[PDB]
Design a binder for this molecule. Structure first.
Ligand SMILES: Nc1nc2c(ncn2[C@@H]2O[C@H](COP(=O)(O)OP(=O)(O)OP(=O)(O)O)[C@@H](O)[C@H]2O)c(=O)[nH]1
Ligand SMILES: Nc1nc2c(ncn2[C@@H]2O[C@H](COP(=O)(O)OP(=O)(O)OP(=O)(O)O)[C@@H](O)[C@H]2O)c(=O)[nH]1
Ligand SMILES: Nc1nc2c(ncn2[C@@H]2O[C@H](COP(=O)(O)OP(=O)(O)O)[C@@H](O)[C@H]2O)c(=O)[nH]1
Ligand SMILES: [Mg+2]
Ligand SMILES: [Mg+2]
Lengths: 52, 436, 44, 52, 49, 19, 426, 427
């Protein structure tokens, strides 16, 4: 006869954890984009150095 | 009760890799190949026996053959995470590609790879005990999955015959395509996909892209999410053999309740609720709205409009928190609704089945864990619609004899292109007759 | 991707080239059908 | 009611009001009226402060 | 595809109150005051059915 | 680099207690 | 979502564009180096309409600078907020039209417009949903008027369903820069009346009078005039970039202003414009905005509206205002001066409100009135055109570039029947 | 017992922004979506400790929509609900009825289907739109046409906003109002008029706010909607459903244009000196100085009247006041109605919102009438439509979008037929 409210509550808090994890991955992607930008700015500085 | 699973081509083995990850996570099997527990709440012990055969002691090796002509993805798999999981011989790798060529796949390299494939599957079957049947995973757009897929199917039918063969095939979308000669390929493959498979389930990619855009709101989905959803669908439809529930169905139920005539076997698939972690916590999940969403065509894996067609018969697998009361209520509501209509030669057109174990989630996936889910597999005339949409663009290219020299060079005669056109026309005619 | 460079040359206008033509007023092709029946008559 | 019925037909607080004929004829919540008058005056003073 | 461990699952009958019993069954009985009936005494009035 | 759990028959091949 | 790509043609266009992008850039708080430095969140979400995030907080404008000589480009590149444009969007030539509309429309456009079309087409497909194109040019010069005219023609041939704004300055005899001004203006207007959706007419004479009387500036440089025009352009498209109680997009203003497809030359104003000494004695109420908005001595055109009839009008307001005061002022202004409004259109004023004022102010406004007093300026040019054309002065320059005489006859015919139809609806 | 509320246009979801604020406050629902069965008519208890309203905010320009997505009620509204296009209809009925509607109404209809499926005892629909614009009028009309072929006889309360006669913010709103009314006649079940100048006079005179913005207008419009749906929500002594308005206020199937009113709209400090009773507010709901539509019912004859009462009210005094009105001769009923009233009483007093301007009042009246003053309104709009159409002004826009002049001629003569009908009934 159906699922128990304790099991439903467990499913709900696991869903909340899933939401949190998606937000963590979003922040991770922002951090990797920053990391990709920094190295390319260094590369462009080296290019200017070589031109001069 | 055991079922074996073969994968042919690139897309086939990528879907299978996803499926096998899902199966391992369901059954608690480490990537080493051993289950570090005997708790196994599930439906009972000896559940894994349907997919993993227990070997030696404390070791489980899947009942599958991945096989491919290009070695690249096979040895990517070999070097990846589940090295110690698959048997080394189960993975089978040629040396050169079939390269989008049905003839190259069916007559040039099939003749060397298929004998090895068959005498491997023979000992797999012999090891097996109560074999339910084979399930094939292939893409008809490519060369491998098309040509030697059909070759393997012909050889399996001539070897065994009376055993079920579930083909979950990937068709070309109407406009989305990553090939050019895929219409030729699809027509040459369907010529044998008609009379060799018993239950053939189409999956386009554009429908899954639309689903992932709308429901899961992923703006940039790759093939990984497609494969994970296809694995989920396969798991939902085999949970009935795997675990026990209120109303179970085996593989032999699809051939009984969904195939009114031995030639009309092409099934729309669907799944619900395809829902993300935020939409889970904001929509309430009951059986009524998910049965309604399983029929709304914005949640089908094949891009077609069933409002143009009429349903022959449908099958509804339920997973999780389901009692028969609400499922009967929802099916009566659906049958009384009039936006969809059934064919008159079938007054009662539903087959329901329920299993108690809820669907599992793979960490890293984008589907939330839900109380319950529904896997819909129907039969209609959107499939003859799709077939004509494809026949039109096949005939377009064939009128000018485009790309024909490849195939003729690889040992395929020009006449074949005429009889497969005629076969598709006859299939269309049959569908149009039956729909009335 | 536009036209080749040679075809991007200019052409000359006229007096009323781009102004739109408004056709004659006439009864439409899909008239509005009347669901609600009319009010009755006062004398009856 | 003709549609929905949350309250009893003899509920004491409702009966105490309806029975108090003066409360039916004129009813006020003087405290809230004071608070709302002060709220209006404060909004006017906030507007004038923003203009200043 | 990194190595992943599935979430642990609960037993299927968790969260259910046991049939061990608290000397009295679950469904609450009638609650009422004690009052002498007309004539014979020691009778029982159900205030809350 | 994680060791696996061998079967008892192959993990204790020729080990024999002797009293 | 909605996109506005900017095209600058010629010397006047390029310097207007430089000040315009300077104004927008701190409207949205971005520094001249190209990063965000604002405070509110309300500046972030609506810079897709004008900019493109490149890499790590770099917002480049969506503009196409376009001319024939690098003098204007280097004047642009020198000053601040000049290092923000992408160098791929600078299309330039090595010749110069030299106020020769024939050169700017037949000889030099023939080899530059292919590349100009490629850059504007790239900048139009880089986005998803165009709202409209926005060009700023003159009607006296060659490389601004002539090429801007050819580009308008080719664009409207390509993208006919999208909006199109043209901020064009027209000349006056008192402020008469080019000697062939009527030969350029007449031919360019002859093109704008079949290609441009609407044209917002500016002129420098009125701008001088504004900085003379109203602003009480001593020495008004061109920078301040270009700042007036930019604040006008900002007031036009503030409703796209900022939420309001009553929104109004460009197409919404177009359909409300243009009753007939050829009557799309608008006279423009801006308020508040007050001297720094007189800012102390005033108040800030919607009456204080409208009393200055409807003044004939505040329109940015040399067309006195009380000489004719206001066909339609529009007012774009910025700031936290009370719509009851807004609409009542619009009603009152309509009821007092009741003869200056056309009779067969009731309630001739479209009005809209945005909640974000320009930084530093509490309240502002922008007026776009489509009157019939504009045929004053078109006749004021048409008589000069036919005066020169009776003696065929300066004509060899135009004829030598391959333009015939019938092009001039058609241009004058379009000018004449146009002002004929303004006189009809007046 | 549920009713769902769809909002079509810029004014629509600004009203919705005020209405749903009011509902959440009345049922104690915090903005994040949970309480710290009366709510069931508007919300669905989803999952656990979450209530998602029954509505669809649909619009074409995304500006105000994602303003709602970033406002305070990010969590309260289901993300899918807020439907939004990409480009505006821009005060163009043809553009909003044939150009963009064709791609948005299928999505909106297939969302409203599964809202009705989640429902169990659907009472009706109620739509919100201002007919001046293009979105609220164009695809609003297309939505009602397709909603009626979808359901047919379901009661659709239309709380429309007509353009006021002298005060106006557009120039093409006569064209939009006329092309919209030809469908507002034959597809809306009961329609409620709401001009803006009448509400301006109310806020100027009664609530003594010298500078009212749209937020004050939408606040009291939410009060009127709250008062006529409180019979569904809050249990009263003598309640009347959404089906009673069709039964007792529509004497002829083509005559459904109800003047609205409310009382007491009264400020904080004036209320101290006012002997607020039931008799004088029943009076106060009948003068033109307190109606929601700028018209004068002294020129009209009342077809019927509906009276919603809230607070500490018994059937006794409402029978006394109704008796008083029927003996007065300042206002006159139509002879054919011999029992021209219908009362209704509810227990729950109206609420106050933080930042609201209405006082905490213990009893209130919301009147919904029917007269011939509306017949005066349509003719007043018909003349200023024929003015601008005599010179073919602005017609090139609509014809460019794909229509013809037959729609203009047929909608003009339709309004004329309606005028004849109102002058026949008034006799
Ligand atoms: N759903 C899904 N489809 C895929 C995936 N990978 C490839 N496909 C489809 O496969 C079709 C082409 O066949 P492939 O599997 O790529 O290649 P093939 O079938 O092995 O044929 P060959 O390239 O000659 O070896 C394309 O239309 C793809 O859409 C995948 O990971 N998921
Ligand atoms: N009562 C009230 N009316 C409003 C409000 N906002 C706009 N309106 C009315 O809306 C009418 C114009 O239509 P809008 O709602 O502004 O815009 P629209 O209907 O969506 O049409 P488009 O602008 O093309 O999108 C005007 O006549 C206003 O009277 C409001 O907040 N309250
Ligand atoms: N508002 C404004 N107008 C200018 C400016 N510079 C030039 N103009 C106008 O431009 C007109 C001459 O056009 P011109 O610049 O020579 O165009 P071009 O030669 O084709 O680029 C004159 O009428 C000037 O009034 C400026 O800085 N501001
Ligand atoms: Mg392949
Ligand atoms: Mg709008």
């Amino acid at each position: 006869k159906g699922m128990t409210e304790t099991e439903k509550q467990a499913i709900l808090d696991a869903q909340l954890a899933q939401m949190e994890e998606k937000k963590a991955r979003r922040a991770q992607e922002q951090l990797e984009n920053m990391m990709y930008a920094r190295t390319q700015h260094d590369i462009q500085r080296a290019l200017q150095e070589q031109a001069q | 009760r055991e079922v074996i699973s073969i994968h042919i081509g690139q897309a086939g083995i990528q879907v299978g890799n996803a499926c096998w990850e899902l199966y391992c996570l369901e059954h608690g099997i480490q990537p080493d190949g051993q289950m570090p527990s005997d708790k196994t709440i599930g439906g009972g012990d000896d559940a894994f026996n349907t997919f993993f055969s227990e070997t030696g002691a404390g070791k489980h090796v899947p009942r599958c053959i991945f096989l491919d002509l290009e070695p690249t993805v096979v040895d990517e798999v070999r070097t990846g995470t589940y090295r110690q999981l698959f048997h080394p011989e189960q993975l089978i790798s040629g040396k050169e590609d079939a390269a989008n060529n049905f003839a190259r796949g069916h007559y040039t390299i099939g003749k060397e790879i298929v004998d090895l494939a068959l005498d491997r599957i023979r000992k797999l079957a012999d090891n097996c005990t109560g074999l339910q049947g084979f399930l094939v995973f292939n893409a008809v757009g490519g060369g491998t999955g098309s040509g030697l897929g059909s070759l393997l199917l012909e050889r399996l039918s001539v070897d065994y015959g009376k055993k079920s063969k579930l083909g979950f095939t990937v068709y070309p979308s109407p406009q989305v395509s990553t090939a050019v000669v895929e219409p030729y390929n699809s027509v040459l493959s369907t010529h044998s996909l008609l009379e060799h498979t018993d239950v053939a389930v189409m999956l386009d990619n554009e429908a899954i892209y639309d689903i992932c855009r709308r429901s899961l709101d992923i703006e940039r989905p790759t093939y990984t999410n497609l494969n994970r959803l296809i694995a989920q669908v396969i798991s939902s439809l085999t949970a009935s053999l795997r675990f026990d529930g209120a109303l179970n169905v085996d593989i032999t139920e699809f051939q009984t309740n969904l195939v009114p005539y031995p030639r009309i076997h092409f099934m729309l698939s669907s799944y619900a609720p395809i829902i993300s972690a935020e939409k889970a916590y904001h929509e309430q999940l009951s059986v009524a709205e998910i049965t309604n969403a399983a029929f709304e065509p914005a949640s089908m894996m094949v891009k077609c409009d069933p409002r143009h067609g009429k349903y022959m018969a449908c099958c509804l697998m339920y997973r999780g928190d389901v009692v028969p009361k609400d499922v009967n209520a929802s099916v009566a509501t659906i049958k009384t609704k009039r936006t969809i209509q059934f064919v008159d030669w079938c007054p009662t057109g539903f087959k329901c089945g329920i299993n108690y174990q809820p669907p599992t989630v793979v960490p890293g996936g984008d589907l939330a864990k839900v109380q319950r889910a529904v896997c819909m597999i129907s039969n209609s005339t959107a499939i003859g619609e799709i077939f004509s949409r494809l026949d039109h663009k096949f005939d377009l290219m064939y009128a000018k004899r485009a790309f024909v020299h490849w195939y003729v060079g690889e040992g395929m005669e020009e006449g074949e292109f005429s009889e497969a056109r005629e076969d598709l026309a006859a299939l269309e005619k049959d569908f149009e007759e039956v729909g009335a | 991707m536009g036209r080749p460079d040679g075809a991007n040359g200019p052409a000359f206008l006229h007096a009323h080239e781009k102004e739109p033509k408004l056709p004659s007023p006439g009864p439409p092709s899909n008239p509005k059908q009347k669901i609600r029946p009319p009010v009755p008559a006062k004398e009856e | 009611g003709r549609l929905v019925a949350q309250v009893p037909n003899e509920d004491p607080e409702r009966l105490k009001r309806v029975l108090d004929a003066k409360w039916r004829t004129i009813g006020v919540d003087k405290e809230t009226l004071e608070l709302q008058a002060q709220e209006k005056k404060d909004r006017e003073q906030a507007e004038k402060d923003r203009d200043e | 595809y990194p190595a992943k461990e599935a979430d642990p699952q609960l037993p299927p009958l968790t969260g259910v109150r046991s049939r061990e019993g608290l000397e009295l069954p679950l469904p609450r009985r009638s609650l009422g005051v004690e009052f002498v009936h007309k004539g014979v005494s020691d009778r029982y009035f159900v205030l809350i059915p | 680099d994680t060791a696996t759990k061998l079967p008892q028959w192959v993990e204790n091949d020729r080990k024999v207690l002797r009293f | 979502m909605r996109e506005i790509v900017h095209i600058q043609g010629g010397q006047c266009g390029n310097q207007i564009g430089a000040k315009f992008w300077e104004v927008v850039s701190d409207e949205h708080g971005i520094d001249p180096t190209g990063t965000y430095h604002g405070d509110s969140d309300l500046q972030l979400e609506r810079i897709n309409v004008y900019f493109n995030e490149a890499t790590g907080g770099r917002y480049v404008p969506r503009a196409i600078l376009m001319d024939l000589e690098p003098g204007t480009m280097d004047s642009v590149r020198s000053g601040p907020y000049g290092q923000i444009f992408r160098p791929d969007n600078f299309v330039f030539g090595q010749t110069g039209a030299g106020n020769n509309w024939a050169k700017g429309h037949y000889t030099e456009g023939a080899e530059l417009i292919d590349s100009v079309l490629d850059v504007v087409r790239k900048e139009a497909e880089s986005c998803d949903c165009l709202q409209g194109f926005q060009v700023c040019h003159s009607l006296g010069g060659g490389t601004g008027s002539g090429m801007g005219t050819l580009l308008i023609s080719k664009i409207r041939e390509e993208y006919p369903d999208r909006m199109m704004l043209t901020f064009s300055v027209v000349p006056s005899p008192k402020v008469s820069d080019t000697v062939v001004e009527p030969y350029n203006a007449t031919l360019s207007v002859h093109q704008l009346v079949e290609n441009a959706d609407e044209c917002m007419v500016l002129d420098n004479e009125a701008l001088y009078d504004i900085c003379f009387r109203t602003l009480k500036l001593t020495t008004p440089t061109f920078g301040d005039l270009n700042h007036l025009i930019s604040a006008v352009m900002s007031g036009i498209t503030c409703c796209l970039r900022f939420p309001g109680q009553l929104n109004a997009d460009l197409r919404k203003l177009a359909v409300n202003l243009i009753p007939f497809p050829r009557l799309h030359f608008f006279m423009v104003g801006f308020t508040p414009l007050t001297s720094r000494g007189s800012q102390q004695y005033r108040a800030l109420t919607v009456p204080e905005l409208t009393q200055q908005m409807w003044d004939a001595k505040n329109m940015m055109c040399a067309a006195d509206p009380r000489h004719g009839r206001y066909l339609t009008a529009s007012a774009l307001f910025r700031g936290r205002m009370s719509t009851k005061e807004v609409d009542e002022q619009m009603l009152n202004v309509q009821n007092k001066n009741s003869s200056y409004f056309v009779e067969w259109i009731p309630n001739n004023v479209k009005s809209s409100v945005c909640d974000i004022p320009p930084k530093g102010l509490k309240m502002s406004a922008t007026f776009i009135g489509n009157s019939t007093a504009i045929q004053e300026m078109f006749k004021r040019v048409s008589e000069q055109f036919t005066a020169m054309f009776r003696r065929k002065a300066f004509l060899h320059w135009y004829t030598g570039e391959g333009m015939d005489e019938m092009e001039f006859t058609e241009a004058e015919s379009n000018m004449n029947d146009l002002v004929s139809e303004y006189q009809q609806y007046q």
